[PDB]
Amino acid sequence: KSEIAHRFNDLGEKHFKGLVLVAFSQYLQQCPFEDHVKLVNEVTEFAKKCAADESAENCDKSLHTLFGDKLCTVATLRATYGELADCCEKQEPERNECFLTHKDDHPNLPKLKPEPDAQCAAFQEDPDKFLGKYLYEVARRHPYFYGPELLFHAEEYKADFTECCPADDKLACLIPKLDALKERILLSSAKERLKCSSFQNFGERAVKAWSVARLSQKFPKADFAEVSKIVTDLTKVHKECCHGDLLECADDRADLAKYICEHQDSISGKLKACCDKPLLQKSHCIAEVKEDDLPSDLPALAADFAEDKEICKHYKDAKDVFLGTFLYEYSRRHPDYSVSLLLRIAKTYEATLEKCCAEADPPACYRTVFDQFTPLVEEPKSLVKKNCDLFEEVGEYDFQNALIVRYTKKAPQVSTPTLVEIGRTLGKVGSRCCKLPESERLPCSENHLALALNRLCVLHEKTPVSEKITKCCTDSLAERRPCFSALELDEGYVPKEFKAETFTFHADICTLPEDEKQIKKQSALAELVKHKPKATKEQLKTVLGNFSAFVAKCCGAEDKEACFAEEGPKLVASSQLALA
Ligand SMILES: COc1ccc2cc(CC(=O)O)ccc2c1
Numbered sequence: 001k002s003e004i005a006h007r008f009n010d011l012g013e014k015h016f017k018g019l020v021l022v023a024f025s026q027y028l029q030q031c032p033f034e035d036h037v038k039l040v041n042e043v044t045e046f047a048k049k050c051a052a053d054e055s056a057e058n059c060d061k062s063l064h065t066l067f068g069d070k071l072c073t074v075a076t077l078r079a080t081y082g083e084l085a086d087c088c089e090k091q092e093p094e095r096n097e098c099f100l101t102h103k104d105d106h107p108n109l110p111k112l113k114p115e116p117d118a119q120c121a122a123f124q125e126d127p128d129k130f131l132g133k134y135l136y137e138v139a140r141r142h143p144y145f146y147g148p149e150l151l152f153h154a155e156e157y158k159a160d161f162t163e164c165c166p167a168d169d170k171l172a173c174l175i176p177k178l179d180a181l182k183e184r185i186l187l188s189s190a191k192e193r194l195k196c197s198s199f200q201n202f203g204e205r206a207v208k209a210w211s212v213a214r215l216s217q218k219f220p221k222a223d224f225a226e227v228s229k230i231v232t233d234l235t236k237v238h239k240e241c242c243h244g245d246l247l248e249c250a251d252d253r254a255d256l257a258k259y260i261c262e263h264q265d266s267i268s269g270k271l272k273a274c275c276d277k278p279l280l281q282k283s284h285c286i287a288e289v290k291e292d293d294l295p296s297d298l299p300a301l302a303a304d305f306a307e308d309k310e311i312c313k314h315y316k317d318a319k320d321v322f323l324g325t326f327l328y329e330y331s332r333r334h335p336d337y338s339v340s341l342l343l344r345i346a347k348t349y350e351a352t353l354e355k356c357c358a359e360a361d362p363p364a365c366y367r368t369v370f371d372q373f374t375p376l377v378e379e380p381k382s383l384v385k386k387n388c389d390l391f392e393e394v395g396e397y398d399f400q401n402a403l404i405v406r407y408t409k410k411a412p413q414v415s416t417p418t419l420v421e422i423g424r425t426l427g428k429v430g431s432r433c434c435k436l437p438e439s440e441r442l443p444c445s446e447n448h449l450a451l452a453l454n455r456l457c458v459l460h461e462k463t464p465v466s467e468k469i470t471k472c473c474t475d476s477l478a479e480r481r482p483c484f485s486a487l488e489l490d491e492g493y494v495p496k497e498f499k500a501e502t503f504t505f506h507a508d509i510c511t512l513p514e515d516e517k518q519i520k521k522q523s524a525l526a527e528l529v530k531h532k533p534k535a536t537k538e539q540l541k542t543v544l545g546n547f548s549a550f551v552a553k554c555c556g557a558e559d560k561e562a563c564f565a566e567e568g569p570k571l572v573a574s575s576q577l578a579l580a
């Protein structure tokens with residue numbers, strides 16, 4: 001009868017309000033917190049009014065009709081969001097489809113820096129409003145954040161402020177906790193942006209293929225019927241809150257958590273801890289659940305997928321279904337393979353049957369299909385061993401520096417801030433994955449590379465500069481990392497016009513936090529590669545060493561500004577000659 005009433009009844013007032021605020025904040029990122037709270041209230045009031053008499057007028061209307069109508073009431077819409085105001089002319093589903101399009105993944109809003117004194121005072125005088133502020137702030141900085149996951153992260157936030165506002169030291173309790181949370185948000189955001197990116201660019205079939213591989217790894221003892229059910233239900237959950245249907249998304253995610261936990265004995269022995277937790281905790285715990293031990297009775301696949309004489313017959317009859325089965329079974333027995341590698345192997349299996357089932361005697365052709373996988377497995381293992389050997393040797397900052405040089409040579413047209421952010425994110429992959437048991441290194445590395453490279457691809461949709469990057473981002477989801485790995489310096493690139501002020505440093509740097517200095521120095525490294533792109537990585541390491549030395553020296557000088565002014569131009573001059 002009335003959908004708005006249905007969701008309000010199910011989710012509760014608090015969660016309904018939470019998700020509705022996120023939804024509004026994600027669509028309208030530049031509008032004030034004052035304004036969003038009033039739409040949140042007005043909509044909520046309508047849901048209560050509808051939940052009372054469902055037969056009331058306008059209550060029959062869809063969430064999209066109602067949420068999109070409310071978005072067109074917002075003061076100064078044409079002035080602030082001209083691009084988004086045109087959509088308000090259109091009917092549904094055209095209008096929401098129009099809204100979704102005009103979202104910003106890099107809205108350049110100020111860095112989210114904690115103030116222990118002022119925030120604790122805001123939390124005390126009204127916690128409900130203080131938590132609302134958090135949802136708003138993070139939502140407009142991550143327009144594709146997993147809605148119910150945000151409500152979960154907003155509880156971690158509240159848990160930190162409840163612990164640290166009465167405490168003796170208000171900074172030393174709160175500063176490293178909110179930095180760890182900001183770290184966790186960046187990762188949750190990254191995973192859920194790859195999901196939405198995969199829908200936008202490659203489609204539902206691609207997201208399903210990815211989910212089959214991942215869940216098969218996480219739940220190896222689950223039947224193919226069970227894994228299919230969960231993938232079907234999970235893919236609909238992600239499709240919904242990637243498309244802004246946060247009320248639908250939240251309801252469906254809770255149902256799937258309820259399902260996985262009712263059937264946990266047939267799915268995995270790792271879910272017992274997750275299933276005895278509250279609703280938001282439960283959903284988060286399952287999503288991040290440890291992989292189940294391999295079953296003793298795991299079947300041999302050679303007979304079914306290489307030896308059997310009617311494989312072509314099976315394959316031809318229903319391709320997507322047969323391929324699903326192979327993906328399911330091969331992923332189950334390889335928790336030591338990345339998802340992208342499993343999708344690569346599946347695409348090589350598909351290719352072998354396409355070829356072999358055109359020839360005179362197929363069985364003799366596809367008998368050795370599994371041996372076509374060995375080179376696909378050794379390539380990534382090489383790149384992980386090589387990058388981890390480099391990381392453990394030189395550390396996060398130099399490894400990051402090695403990667404900024406690698407990717408600035410690949411895509412020198414890409415902005416320095418973008419190259420630096422990607423180099424630094426790729427550097428974290430070394431820190432996170434190289435320390436893990438070497439069996440867990442490959443999956444960790446490639447699954448986090450997918451996040452880092454999807455970031456780069458998202459930034460590159462906004463400001464396209466490179467046809468090589470476009471091709472790597474749009475061609476094939478499974479072949480992305482290999483595609484990016486394959487890029488070399490463009491021999492037809494014109495070296496950056498040397499601008500002296502680009503490499504000019506002042507005393508301002510000396511007061512900066514550690515990482516903020518790194519960013520400034522790493523920004524300079526990128527600008528060096530752009531001006532002298534044929535310079536060896538060993539040349540660049542030397543020159544930036546000299547830059548670091550110079551900065552440390554002048555920050556410790558009596559007259560810091562005089563030191564930068566006298567030393568700086570000499571260093572820049574001789575740096576040009578060292579990079580020949
Ligand atoms: C374990 O950490 C890493 C970090 C960056 C990597 C980059 C690549 C991709 C490339 O070759 O450019 C491959 C493995 C990596 C492993």
Ligand SMILES: COc1ccc2cc(CC(=O)O)ccc2c1
Pocket residue numbers: 205206209320321323324327343344346347475476477478479
């Ligand atoms: C149903 O089985 C599959 C297996 C591998 C797949 C890989 C991709 C990835 C890509 O096409 O680049 C997409 C769908 C798949 C479906």
Ligand SMILES: COc1ccc2cc(CC(=O)O)ccc2c1
Pocket residue numbers: 390394398399401402403405525537538540541542544545
């Ligand atoms: C400051 O520029 C750097 C720093 C460290 C690096 C390490 C490597 C690793 C290597 O030298 O083989 C490569 C480039 C770098 C660039």
